Amino acid sequence: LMKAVDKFEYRRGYKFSTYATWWIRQAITRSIADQARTIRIPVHMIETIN
DNA sequence: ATTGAGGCTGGTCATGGCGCTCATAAATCTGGTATACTTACCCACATTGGGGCTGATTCTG
Numbered sequence: 001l002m003k004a005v006d007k008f009e010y011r012r013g014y015k016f017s018t019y020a021t022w023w024i025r026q027a028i029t030r031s032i033a034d035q036a037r038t039i040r041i042p043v044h045m046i047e048t049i050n
Numbered sequence: 051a052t053t054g055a056g057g058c059t060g061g062t063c064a065t066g067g068c069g070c071t072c073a074t075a076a077a078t079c080t081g082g083t084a085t086a087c088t089t090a091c092c093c094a095c096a097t098t099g100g101g102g103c104t105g106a107t108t109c110t111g
Contacts, residue, residue: 007083014085022084042079 003027 004023008016033046041049 019085
């Protein structure tokens with residue numbers, strides 16, 4: 001959310017929630033793919049497994 | 051107890067598969083950005099310590 005706030009633009013006329021949701025979900029998924037296993041697995045291989 | 055030959059001590063010449071080193075390259079590993087709108091989870095005992103009384107000696111109106 002802080003990262004999304006750092007790059008939000010209000011001139012487009014869209015609400016902040018639509019822009020912030022993408023960043024929040026991307027950060028959450030990246031964290032899950034990074035630090036949720038005892039043995040680290042790369043993001044591309046995690047995506048292939050999914 | 052000598053001088054005439056064999057077996058065995060010195061080095062020749064490369065030789066040959068092995069190992070360390072250079073370089074190429076596609077597969078693997080990292081960082082990055084997405085714009086209709088989504089807003090508060092889900093058993094039974096014994097002992098010591100803390101907090102609320104319970105008088106019981108000091109002082110009071």
